[PDB]
Amino acid sequence: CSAPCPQDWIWHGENCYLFSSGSFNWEKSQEKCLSLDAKLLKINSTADLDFIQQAISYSSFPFWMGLSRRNPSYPWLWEDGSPLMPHLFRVRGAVSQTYPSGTCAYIQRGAVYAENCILAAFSICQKKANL
């Protein structure tokens, strides 16, 4: 019998969540979550969103999530290739620009924003809880 999640992670529902130790571009953030046998945050419901905002309520830092698109002609997709479900959140910020390395989304102050993927931000990683 093992714990649902490792020490320092937050156990919520079927998953475990962790804030990254550092601030890096999106690709490096993706790599760092993978190294923890995890992936960047994927929001499947408004319950997920509300839990995340509860958890980052005390931070003003922007946190990358696993949502990105190459440019505005591409829909937003999660790392696993699934789409952003409707009625979860409206992505604001830099949504009309095209960046050499794509556009990625981060959550900050309870909202989701588009930004150049080459910029640095902390991130939230998640993995399945051992239940």
The binding site for a second copy (CB under 8 A) comprises 1-5, 7-13, 19-22, 51, 53-61, 63, 122
Strands 77-78 and 39-40: unpaired
Under DSSP, is residue 85 helix (H, G, I), strand (E, B) or coil?
Answer: coil
Q: Which is nearer to a second copy, 14 or 37 (CB)?
A: 14
What is the closest distance, in whole angstroms, from the C-beta atom of residue 19 to a second copy in the complex? 6
- Asked whether 21 and 108 are in contact (CB, 8 A), the reply is no
What is the closest distance, in whole angstroms, from the C-beta atom of residue 77 to a second copy in the complex? 26
Report how far residue 98's alpha carbon sits from residue 92's, in angstroms, rounded to the nearest whole number. Answer: 15
What is the closest distance, in whole angstroms, from the C-beta atom of residue 72 to a second copy in the complex? 31
- Asked whether 4 and 131 are in contact (CB, 8 A), the reply is yes
Extract the tokens encoding 115. 């930004």
Report how far residue 116's alpha carbon sits from residue 82's, in angstroms, rounded to the nearest whole number. Answer: 21
Q: Which is nearer to a second copy, 7 or 73 (CB)?
A: 7
What is the closest distance, in whole angstroms, from the C-beta atom of residue 16 to a second copy in the complex? 10
Q: Which is nearer to a second copy, 61 or 99 (CB)?
A: 61
Q: Which is nearer to a second copy, 113 or 122 (CB)?
A: 122
- Asked whether 5 and 16 are in contact (CB, 8 A), the reply is yes
